[model samples]
Target chain A: HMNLCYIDGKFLPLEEAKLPVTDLIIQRGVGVFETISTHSRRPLMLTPHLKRLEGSATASSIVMPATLDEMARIIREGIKKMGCETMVRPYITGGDSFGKDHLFSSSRYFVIFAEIRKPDPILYEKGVALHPINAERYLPSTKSINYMLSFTGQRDSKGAYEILYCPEGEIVEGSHSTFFLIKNGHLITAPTSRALSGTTRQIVLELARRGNIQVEERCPLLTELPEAEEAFITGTVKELLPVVRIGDQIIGNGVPGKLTKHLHQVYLSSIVEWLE
Target chain B: MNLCYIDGKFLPLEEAKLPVTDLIIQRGVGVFETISTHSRRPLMLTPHLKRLEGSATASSIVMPATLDEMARIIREGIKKMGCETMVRPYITGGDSFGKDHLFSSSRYFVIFAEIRKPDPILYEKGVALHPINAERYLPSTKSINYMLSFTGQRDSKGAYEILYCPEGEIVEGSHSTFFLIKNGHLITAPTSRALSGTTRQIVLELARRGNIQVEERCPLLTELPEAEEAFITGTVKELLPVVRIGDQIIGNGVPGKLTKHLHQVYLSSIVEWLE
Candidate 1:
């Protein structure tokens, strides 16, 4: 149950939180939000996550509401309130006021820590199936809160469990996850206009390069996917989930490819587990 | 102040409120979301707003995590928090746990109340929502950050609503969509690349469901002047049931059979207490 929210430096219950309607809800319709999951007992990749939020605020022309320093304090305090070892959910939205749109843009910042367990081992094993769609991710980097645009339908297809998006007929990335395809023993994904430069993707690419596994951030065609030898998706939670289906086109062997397994192992050893 | 949010059981806010490294920044990626006014003091415009949001959610393909569950959560929030105001938040995906492949299909919901009161004048005096001649929003969905998508601008200065579309079709409301009737045959933008009005749909249903017009799904704007009646539809105050369009009087320069019945029925529906 909601006991209290941090206000004016004191702990107030959930109901006490109030913002002006016109200021926050109407005029600007302004707010930038994000949700995060916690690991066994520690926040995961929070530092990088905060940086990305700031970038999103700037890009959307949304003003930076409060100082990042202050945000860190409140999030930590929220975590304390949650009494969870590791957690996520750091967000900022323009506050309900007339102080900043033309200037610096005032924002309301906060965090919510929910109890989460380690990801299931099955996700890391075998291989995952994907249903690729023709939806384009308008903004591919900032975690602003508007992605359900393409994800809902993809989730209901009942065939492939996960969905991937391709803008203008080119495979961009997955809805909430980053995508990877292997062709000619080389890993390929988009690098420019589309695709979020994922933290996990970055780590994987680095490992592939160091270990001499070819990794190229290049956009691939839908027709080319079927020919690829292996495919997979990466993120904070699942880390690396192999892809075996693309809209009913059973990829080679119809299972997680061998290369996908090797990278998963390498990916696990390379990054700080749970990104602690 | 942080103290206020904390006292209300609101999630403790950070100084900046954003994670130091947020994905919305790094990837220019994230989701589309919205949070409507919770304190329906707009008097009789609550249900319309909820309906508007629901359609918007569908158009953008953003699923409501759980409508029943959300209603419960919101009521609980309002009870303990007091009703100064609430801003509902819309999301496509979140970082950390939110993955890319499933991001578009994923959504997050949040609602926060504001400390100030809403201005009553805007409602009393209907503002002119100028048509921008483009369509960015899907037929009935209200996707966010689209000022640029239409005319490459965001602010609404001098203009109240800026109508637009993704392609070359005249849809309805910019932030809202509407329909004009001619010759008793319903007339509306054929392309739904615009925001579908929750209130607008109500008027249509009222015309049909209540044994009114047995309504026909409208088509594009053709010979609009010859229509027997005309009306504006959208979120906020649905079925503004027009008194006049430009200079022409629709339905005897007054709210016609469709709109008047709509407002009456519309008002009737919102009173059903959810919480």
Candidate 2:
């Protein structure tokens, strides 16, 4: 059976969902999206993701189509209909219009309940490689749908799990995730000013603090990767996957370091508590 | 009475739709060109089509139809419309499973809409621009990612367009190519820094033939105070004058002599071409 999608107020199969080409979402890429993974069929960190979506909408000048409570209710209903572990994508865009006035028009909101394409278990055991690209996102703080460089980078660089944005030798973040490098037991990440305020990134930081691990909010230089003991990326679906290599430089004996594993374990444990 | 050509099929504009699974919607992986028309004849159609093809190549999108075929489709739509119109040709990554690099083909479409000409009084008196500290991602390609320009236009009121000033250096306008006149010399940003506008190229050629010196370099934001006059060029905005940028009045707060002459020259060239 096809998963159900909630577009506007109607629920339909994902394959049947369609948006008019005139909508600014398709015309100008004027939209914001949040990808929320489910734990035991319940969306993980739903509130934070929605809050970030609101921020994205505000920054992109897209008015929210529904209240957070209403959106939450719709998301839960869609998930219940799907009846499996799913990746929930909630999107809001400037609705259809014939002129530039569409920027100020009311928005169209939709939710897609998709089957989660979980990463390979062997990837978790063996870690992954990253390809560093010299590029930075326009409006790094907002989750707009302008992924031109991100998509191109991923397409051009084969065998890379994710592409890291290292504009001017400083790591900003991943195309789809937040980047972190561990050095001397300190958890370091680019400040939110230069990267998206990722939902999982916030939770991982909180877990680090509670676990008594030091957290530093700064962009690590690309040159510092070789000397780092561990590296990893955090996202809605990635969930703290370790990075053992960036480009050709093997990070810390080319394996997921011990602290990375420890943090991942605690992160998974914290998810249960967050769901409750 | 609206007409659109989509994937080799002609339909009403409102009926033309793309599946939600296309990467163009999900990732802004698309390219477009807007051609202005006069007397049911498309203006500068060749250059616009070539630029569209260049943009598609730069964005890794395949052109599903040849240039002649695309032009034939556009001309057919123009003939069907039976009036002055603006034709927009768009190419997008086709339907996929929402994966960025997973599209099996590309989709092409052309939509014909009524041309909304700018007010003649504004062109005579000149327009004001709202300067914003931002730049286009991949400024060379006419990609579909117009979020910055759209939001910038929405936020700035009482302004004709938003001027992109990245790090105190003037790049270009949100939807137009900017040019400055200082002591009767024409100054504009290089194609590397802007979109290589077709109208901009025409204006530059006209200036060179008229014995006006041209400098292709981005002017500093601080240089606006010294500019004798300014103007912006685009497919829709042929040669609109600019007398104000932000709060600074440009050159006695009126369109300068050179700007008016160049605009007249551009109009004459268009008439000659159409005839």
Candidate 3:
């Protein structure tokens, strides 16, 4: 039997899993989601992702169709059927906006499965370069599909992919990732307002607290880049990948800082505890 | 005999199930344009194309093909499908997820439909307006994210259409552009944060050529109630008369003399192309 994709309450072929052109997902870009990396068909950290996805639906005023328990069962079984390493994305939309606040009257849910790519060691080893762009993520914490600016636009320089969003002299966030800067033996990142509350960043902050490292949440300005001894980005897939340069300015010695490397080891080793 | 063009391919519209993963549809962050046919052929193609170009540029999407190619294809495709139809152009970023989600994934596509004539009653006596609390995002760009405009329409509430204003300043209609006639002078909001509607531009030119005074600025909410007459314009509606907004009657509660005259002018001006 072919693999299936879930929409609303039905299971359809992955190829047939399409939304109508009239739906809010197509008309308004109005949807929220969470993607969890699966290892050998066993989802990693389903609880936190479930909490976040439900939280996003609630915050967006979308009455979620599936309960957390029901959703978890669908996801866990979906992964088990696949029986291969992959990524699972679960999202909620207001459904077909034929008229009125269709978003309020109708709620649609979808689960898509795709192969997950392993993180490149080169990025973690040598670090990646960041180019600053002027744009801000809308509803920074909701995981909304309003990612037009982050995902589309100008082609950045080769060998560098992450875009650091800094508009009007203030550093907001990375287009699709969260940012961090380490300076003077202290770890720093933007408050939840400037960027997404990344799960990796949350874990990193928790580890810092447990390790007795000083932590600051104020987002550094563009002017403060030079003072940072080290920099890095975090996301579901990126983990604590280091940053070597910001537009010709070398971060520290253009290498992953010792502290960053140390934490990467600590975080990767701690993944098993969080994995289900 | 049913042929369609999507992402540079001529196919049956039934086969075109657009990817649900595309960023434009997924995020409602895409742009679109619609051009109607006259006598089984496209009319005012150039202006619609120009607006699409402007909209794509504003939204940071590169046109998938040259304007000439798009025009030729639309003409050929519409004619192939028997000419009496409306052509719609859609462009959205392609499938992108994960860390690479931040990279540009532009995709261009289009659709076509049979034209539906507007209700004669709407323009004859005039349609009512329902004011909404929000304004269109990047209003100058005719993006596909139209939920804000299409939603909040209440037929029982006597709203034939929706008008949006962020504060006290009126922006534009959700599905069309709006205008007001005050003391014999014409007033309309600028095309800046509002859609530079092709019909709005054409109407403005018609009024200007006819020696009717025209002023472009924000139609303040307070000054609107004093308007002698008001109307909304769009490709479908042309110049529909507006008798009421909310509960306040506009200009003797009937379609104004100037509004009806402009509607007549719009009808006659369009007749030549179709004939």
Candidate 4:
């Protein structure tokens, strides 16, 4: 029962775990990470998180020291030791001295766990606001540490839920979440360019498939946002938080749509199925 | 002597370890300034300070320490480090957590150093160039995020440097500024799409003052081989001739006349001003 974080293999007290300033996470803002929500001390969607973590590492050209089985064992151990709902953060970066000598052969990866944050009832009840901003990330698919774009966006938008990046006219994903718009009973989200394949976004899409909701992966033009019946941003923590407005433009009646609510219920039930 | 300055406190380098969780540095959410030595003293202090302040402004990072304060700190560091080393001052996204408290966040700055010297061979034979297929973000600010430049090239037998050319138009180097002398005309890439290195500005100024032909614009990849002379400018390395870039041999396959002349001129100007 060691309440420790994993770094370079051994379990160390969370207080003792520190990375060199020379690590890529600091040097180049280049690293990949995953955050998993836990339920009753068990990580929900643990398999999918690990898979994305691996994919992110590959995209960054860094190799993880642990195998899938090893990662599972260590994460499961940390979750058990915490003995409560937790938030797991697994990170990997181009190792120390990320200067001229940086190479994929030399990279650092680790995991840190913290208490889980409860979802906001108000947000679920009324939904959140999203503002369009201009900031192009290098690799949208990988969960790299370069999040200044969203940070800048949120700073300007008065702490909105997410920052939507739409260049020219077409919409991309949110700074930290996947964007969706429901129009004419069809679900449409950005499928190309760069965006983190959100686990929740995927599950919602699956539910859409099962419920026979028309799913379109491509994003409609920003000019077409007013044509939607409803819209909501999706993330692990901000699951099914509807979007009532985008810059003075009310979405439908400025409330979470019936379809979005039903999808949220369906998603929660799916989580329950896994937990059981 | 305590040479490192973290936030407002002066501590030794070892005691100045930044928090691993600092959003700025941790996530490439900051900018920095590195000043190299000139004749045993800090060179181009004014320009470097100005550039860093501009960077801080662009990153929305707070500036608890002003240019004068930073100059004093850097001078103090130089005196402690014996004026023979380069001191890099990094200002990261304020240490505040989360989006709501972002404005309330206090900025963090640290000064680290190492003994500085130039490679004589870098000027004699020239430095080789490698072409990279990536572009820089925050082109105006000298942000700490240099991932693309650092990883742009593949495995190299030596410490390889890569030039960012997204579509065959040169931007800038990972750690230095590019200068290509073509057909008796001294040319460097425009600052519109690249980090404007301190040395680059000085070199440009020198060219203008000396009545040397200077053109500031994008350098196409196809025009590289046609260049009669080429080199790079940087704070620490100063001006190093470019003998080859990828598969193209620059000029006469050796340091061009302008390259050597400019290097000597830049070197003498620095040494003279420092003394």
Candidate 5:
């Protein structure tokens, strides 16, 4: 039998679970969620991620049902019931409760686990190519559905494997991924709004700092894309993969630069060991 | 028991139902098809109604499983299925296809045989219509997001029973319908951002056919102050009499001269579309 959920309290089988069809998910598009990974059958990036998700929930005025840690523990327990070690995705959105006084609706959070396969080695190789297009994640901070700008248009373009979205002709970020480029010994990525401030993104920042490569969040526009020495994207699933090219600009003479390769190594090792 | 329908065939409800996870109804972003009534049946406003709805269908980008025949089918279904009901509503625009191309979805209309019911005494005599500090439906299409507009309004009641949704300027209407009258000269609200409603079409065309004067288009909301007479139109509601505005009596504090004349003309037309 497929495992169902860790709803408000107890765990239940798939067909037995029932969550309220509340107003936030129903009425206003007010919700926030995050997806991280797992280690030794326990969730990785739980605390910091839940914390960020809560900030988004608060910003949207969503009334979360339980504390972040408590929610995390419940999710872990649910995984224990299912009996497997794998990657996990925990997400939450606003709960029902259409406001009597026009307040925000409820918030939702849940966890899902899946077996991890060997990472796609090609992506993390010298660097994967990219195709820049326009897709703005309007609120920029939260990982919400509003970011799906054009599913068909982006999916059907030529030579586009990894899509780098540029809202207003300025590269915002990639879908389910973050961007970075190195300039003058300083590591650069998009600073604000247009993509999630991911847990992986933060870890990349910290690792970049220890390498003596000053990490900055200044995202380049489409016009400046050709000037980057090297580029990369970050996400829970993808971790870190260098962007080798965006259109005619062969990135960094067509290879992942020295600094990006170094940071990728440190990012994996540190997150694996819970680095300070 | 619920009912079943496909293109124009009777089928199992499951065959015509969307999955619970479908985004259309869940998001309330789906568009719809609505036609007003003529006395106790649908009006022959299908030609104008079909053309406008065709445009609405295109803007929403739904791959309609219909030709113009769908309009004729709805008009026919109203008569065959309707009993004593005064209005046959076949409001649709649910979905014609799925998010991915080539795949289909259970996106169609529901037939509600409703009797003609008079409005509340408030709307009957005259009603308070105020400026809604909001905007109307999108540019031309009426996307199924009136809930969004209502949520913006806090879903609250107001002295103005009907709202004239205006983002600074009047866009059109949320609910309070529309119609125009020409006593000796022509008069009608000009088309701007609001829906060019089917019933509004009936009133305009019927007035035209009756050889009356017409001024036309979205008159300013302030024009309500100086209007000689006023009336509202919709499919089932037909031509409703409006006599008051925030206690100011419009024309003579009763349905005006042109209001009665146009209302009668509207009735004489449009029953044939149902036949």
Candidate 6:
């Protein structure tokens, strides 16, 4: 029941983990991170998550303090220490620099192991609502720690489960999840360039393709949401959560559609499939 | 000497640390302000503190201390440092409980660092700006999420500051307020488009008193060549001239007469007020 943290080759309790104020992560939010879910105490889709983390690091010009293999080994060690089904958060930041020379500073890597706090099962069954906001992230593909917009958006919209970012009517993605729409029994989502290349999104796409469901890699127009038969969001923690309402418009019948539920089931199965 | 203050505790700057659970580092949920010192006195202290309060309010962070209390704390820190220093005050979202509970008892801290002034030669022969196609999130609020500005600065070397030109319209500098002069007219982006900088407000006031026409609007990127003179203003960088913007020479590639005049006026105003 205890949370653990792995930072720079040292392990400590989560409450005791501290970082100097000089690190760019604290100064300017110059860091990249990935949140990975666990199935039976094993990480799900870790390779893709690590690869996306690497892509984020490269785009942000942060040097990776450890190799991919070494990071994977460290995460595994963290999992073993927690000894429970937990969410793994591996973060890398532009390490400590007092002045404007942060670009030349080395990167620091750390991992957090904490218990998974899943969304209410009843909400998943009834589906959740999203508040639509007109905005787009600075760097859509890089999962940097700059969540100011998301934080504000979520704070402003109290009743909604998530904030849907629609830049000029084109639905980009959610604040922390990938948006997916189903029209005529086909799956549609924004390209990776407009989203964070979500790990759950990749698995959902693969499952849909294997099930012979058509897939479209295009951003669905915000105006077209009311016409769509079904909608959902994918994330490491949210899994495949159904969307019943966006803003004021009820998607389809204001309920989770058949294909949406099927996709969620298959997505969950894919996790178990990979774990085995 | 290094020094910092956090929540009523003073410590060495290098030793000042925050728990990783704080929302500032975990999710960049924070607000900050940088105040410059003149003759060991924090200049524009009231305006800076007001802006910090506004930023915290806009960001949904509770102010841990009153304005007068905060000002007193800063003055005491400056006295302890005993020299001209750049002051940074930050208010974080405190420990978070995932996305739902971001604001859990806000925390405030202040850092006093030695002022690293720009080379005098650059001021005499104005500095160049590297243009980037990006914009800040919540441009009016001084949020801690400075990824875009940091990246632009890091990638572009030999540039004094990065100019943010979102959608072909020149907005502002990465860390300062931008201004341009054409035909004896002063121009700058409005507060709605960029940050309401304290130095920028003073420059505008000075321009109006000096009988210079002022225009508050973002200029198109194509209009840079037509600008007879340009400069950027901030707490640390007070009215630094911009001679060349991305290889395009500004005003014969030297500091403009109007720019120098404004900088001198600004300095005199500061000296007269401090006395």
Best by DockQ: 6
Better of 1 and 4 by TM-score: 4
**Tens digits of per-residue lDDT for model 3, B211-272:** 99888886876886788998888776678888988867887888999988887787778754
Q: TM-score of A-chain in each prediction? A: 0.81, 0.95, 0.90, 0.90, 0.83, 0.94
lDDT against the true structure, per candidate, is 0.53, 0.84, 0.73, 0.74, 0.55, 0.85
Worst 10 residues of 1 chain A by lDDT: A20-29
Interface RMSD score of each model: 9.4, 2.3, 4.6, 3.3, 7.5, 2.2
For model 4 chain A, give the 10-residue run with minimal summed lDDT: A96-105
Candidate 5, superposed: residue stretches over 4 Å from native: A1-4, A8-30, A82-87, A91-97, A104-110, A116-119, A273-276, B1-275
Task: Arrange candidates by TM-score, descending.
Answer: 6, 2, 4, 3, 5, 1
Q: Is the docking of candidate 4 incorrect, acceptable, medium or high quality?
A: acceptable
Q: Write the per-residue lDDT of candidate 4 for residues A1-276, one digit (tens) a residue.
A: 233567767767665666655555665676778888775676777888889988887776676756878878888887877777777788777765443434565667777776776557888788888888655556677777777666655655755667788766677777777888999999999884656788888888889999999988886677887888999888776667788888667889988899989998888777755441
In candidate 6 chain A, where is summed lDDT lowest over 10 consecutive residues?
A: A96-105
Model 4 alpha-carbon miss at residue B135, Å? 1.7
Q: C-alpha displacement of B263 in model 3, angstroms?
A: 3.8
Error of 1 at A92 (Å): 1.1
Error of 3 at B133 (Å): 8.3
Estimate, for each residue in A11-43, the C-alpha lDDT of model 6 and write its tens digit.
Answer: 899999988887888877888999988888888
Range of the 10 consecutive residues with the lowest summed lDDT in candidate 3 chain A:
A96-105
lDDT of 1 by residue, B1-275 (tens): 22112122456233213222323322222333232342443222345346434654454333435555545554554455555444444443223324333333333334454444324443333344334434442344444443232222345444444544234334565445566655554555543344444445556555666655433343333343465555565434445554443333444654456545555676676434222
lDDT of 1 at B98: 45
Every model: Cα RMSD to truth:
9.5, 2.2, 5.3, 3.6, 7.8, 1.9
Clashes of 5: 25
Against the native chain B, what TM-score does each candidate's chain B reach?
Answer: 0.61, 0.94, 0.89, 0.90, 0.72, 0.95
Best by TM-score: 6
Question: How far off is residue B97 in model 4, in Å?
Answer: 4.7
Which parts of model 4 are misplaced by more than 4 Å? A1-17, A65-70, A81-83, A98-106, A273-276, B1-16, B97-111, B115-118, B155-159, B271-275
Work out the TM-score per prediction.
0.59, 0.95, 0.76, 0.88, 0.60, 0.96
**Ranked candidates, highest DockQ first:** 6, 2, 4, 3, 5, 1
